[PDB]
Amino acid sequence: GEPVYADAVLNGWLTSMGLGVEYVRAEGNTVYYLDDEGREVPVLDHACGFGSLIFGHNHPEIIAHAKAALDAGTVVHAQLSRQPRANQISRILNDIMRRETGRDDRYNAIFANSGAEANEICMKHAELERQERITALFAEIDAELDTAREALTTGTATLDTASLPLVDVDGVIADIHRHNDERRAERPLFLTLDGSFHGKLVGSIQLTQNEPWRTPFTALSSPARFLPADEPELIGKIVEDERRSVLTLSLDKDTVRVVERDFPVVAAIFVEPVRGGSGMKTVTPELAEELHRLRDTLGCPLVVDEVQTGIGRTGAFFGSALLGIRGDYYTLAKAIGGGIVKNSVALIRQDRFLPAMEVIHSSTFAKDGLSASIALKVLEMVEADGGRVYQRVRERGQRLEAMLESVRADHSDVVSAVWGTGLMLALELRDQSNATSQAIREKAAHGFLGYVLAGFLLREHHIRVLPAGPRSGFLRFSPSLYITDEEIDRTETALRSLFTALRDQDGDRLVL
Amino acid sequence: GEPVYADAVLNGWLTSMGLGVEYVRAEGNTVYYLDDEGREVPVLDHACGFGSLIFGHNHPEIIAHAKAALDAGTVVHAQLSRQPRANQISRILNDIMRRETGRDDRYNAIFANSGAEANEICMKHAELERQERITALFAEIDAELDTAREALTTGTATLDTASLPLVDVDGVIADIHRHNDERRAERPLFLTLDGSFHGKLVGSIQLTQNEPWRTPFTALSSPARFLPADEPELIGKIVEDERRSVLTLSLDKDTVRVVERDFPVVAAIFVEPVRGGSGMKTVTPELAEELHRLRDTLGCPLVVDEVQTGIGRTGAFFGSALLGIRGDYYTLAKAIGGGIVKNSVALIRQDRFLPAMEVIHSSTFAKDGLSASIALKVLEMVEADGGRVYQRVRERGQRLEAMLESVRADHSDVVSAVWGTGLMLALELRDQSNATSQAIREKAAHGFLGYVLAGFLLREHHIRVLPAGPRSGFLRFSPSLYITDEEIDRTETALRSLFTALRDQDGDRLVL
Ligand SMILES: *Cc1c(COP(=O)(O)O)cnc(C)c1O
């Protein structure tokens, strides 16, 4: 009952899962904790800041570059002054996307401090586009109302009264202006996929499906409709139910009718090339083509969230380029801080980019000189030696995927699938809510199965894995590109061991 | 004509204000740019990352500590593992607030990556509290409906029909359940002060008054009511107009009546101890007492935004402690990164803290090992030598305030006031929209006066000032506590020069 100032419930829960350890040092693919005698125990990290560490913990090149930047007196805080490095970083990302998509498209960069902040820059810029469309629409409706009023008062035309159910000249116009104003003030909608993860701030949390994380906060901010990635013939009808009308007067020279016109409700569509909250499921070509159709049909941007899939994780710089997702806006974060600093970027296509965004959006820490310098170092490293780092991610990915398939094949009773691509992989666990072992069943019923199994891997095999998915029903594997053959072999041994214990329903060995 | 990838409009506008310079190096209170011949030109920084640099640029202690943390292989990415430093930081801030307020209150800490993110943790936790109040209220109303239904059906009591304007037993109950459900789904409200600045993300932007920054994004997220800080007898009535009711059945033994009960609409009240977007105006005792009354009356938390006013800027660690603002939640950011990294914290009083927040809120970069280590260094520095650093801020603040008053006294034709406290000060500029000089008048009409004057200070006196307030009608002075007497004298000379040119309406010298 001693005073506690942070993390009491978090630490309590981690301890009961078998994950209550303090990591005191990290290098490459290894984190170290202290045993009861104070000796360092090496642990293989498969979590790696949820994919932040493409080059591992504390990479010597990144550490050396950061120390040189600090010793040179880099200007970290230079707000409202010329910062050329931002333009230099945007140019590199622009060149990389042209190379990988073969499209000669140009993107403006706005920097931020987290993946959530970068996704919220996109939500905001998407809402600027929607307000432009609304102004244009309402300007036309005024002109259509003036013309109709002209025709009805002068006498040239008669008002059809079969149309009045949708709401007498001046009264009908005021009634249309009221209807349209109510509509204009309504919150927009965002479209996402089922299992989507786009961050946990007031705006972005509405775009994250995981129900315990989101549903408490529903009232704060614009909702998302979660489109079923699996059943995509249902997406058409879900979006069609979200159609909303404004009213105007249509003159067909001699007759005037009240009619509905489309109102732009949807601000943006968001998509992850590889779906973190769905267990690392890659977007299929069929789902990509449906997202393209919705973007072309609604005229709102398609925002590609590469916060996790970017900076080479999938075996290309851009996961979207590898899977043929043709986005309007793109976001990057995790790996761009080199595993030491915090940085993110929204890339917005220049033919849609509203220059007001460059001066009405800002942040104290955004575009700081230190994360800028380190971003340029990370881009230099991932681009080095004629694209060999992408080739190495692809080869390491194949090796790790092959091992995971070989484990699934012999353990199909407890593993349902292997998902993801490059070095962003996961095993799907079969439901254990009917397990013979009461301890396993109880944990699976509370959605803690994945964490319990992660605990086993830590204490028995010195391997750090974290679960994914809304019931911790997936085990994530997202190590650095320096993961060795020996470390993949040790992971295979650890998994065969874990899935043999789970098969044998050994609750005493798995659950504390 | 050439390809540009970021900042074309930002740089264009900075160049035309006379602020188009690249800072290449920074130490203490000085940033350096290169002249045409490639020599470093020293510039005195009064902006200092908008108050981030209480210890100046690249403080050797902070640089040395950051390099040691990188050389020791600090675990930056240790998500879902024991990170004791979070608890250790919260303990220090907890002790500091007890010392400065004399209250023996305890606070839980949630870390984030920016001031906006910390303010959004508070908005989210405030919405958890409101949902708890709503559940309790709706649980009572069910019990009140059951009891009334019992009394009306059994026969013991009669339903009064003078009360039905607010909507047979079953019908009246269904009509109350409909009314109450509509109300329950309505968006909450936040209360802020006029001129409030609380960040620029989807949620926090609604809490920031500056109209060009906010009004484009109105539709996205729950609105704020901006309370007039100046006219506080009007606040009572503005908040009273926001009262909303749910309905229930009140049994007074023989008689059952439909009655209104209070619905919790307001999620939180936010306040800055020193109001950045109002031109560094301190909260008066009268305004503090009104915020206290609203918090006690509505039962929502009072959130104190110390993102700018904290870590000693005002001459205490907490600005709220100095001005007697008794908050439920507190936020810190700018100076806690030591001018090199990005970190923020929400302190939520433990008797209000809902433990679900510890496991349903998270962020990839939050609570990273590197910013944690540097937070502990910054707290060690500001607390050192029995509170001498607070004494030094107070005496440097007095010296700088006295100089600014001495300039106002001789230049009252162009300067209306000195605002703020400690080392967070500003000059208010008199309106120049009627200036004889057409160049000055034109800039003042566009709200760019402060930027133009800042340009003068840079090119003619090598002094970096940035404006504040919604029409750049204030000049900010927020240097490090190492600002020398000689640097204050050079600033006085520069300001006398600027305000003499402004008096003389010398548009050719002031505007390019
Ligand atoms: C981690 C993550 C985010 C949010 O990034 P933060 O830095 O945690 O705000 C957004 N999208 C995806 C796909 C992520 O994995």
Ligand SMILES: *Cc1c(COP(=O)(O)O)cnc(C)c1O
């Ligand atoms: C700067 C500031 C913020 C926003 O902090 P960021 O780090 O820019 O998101 C919020 N509140 C106040 C009072 C500030 O000065």
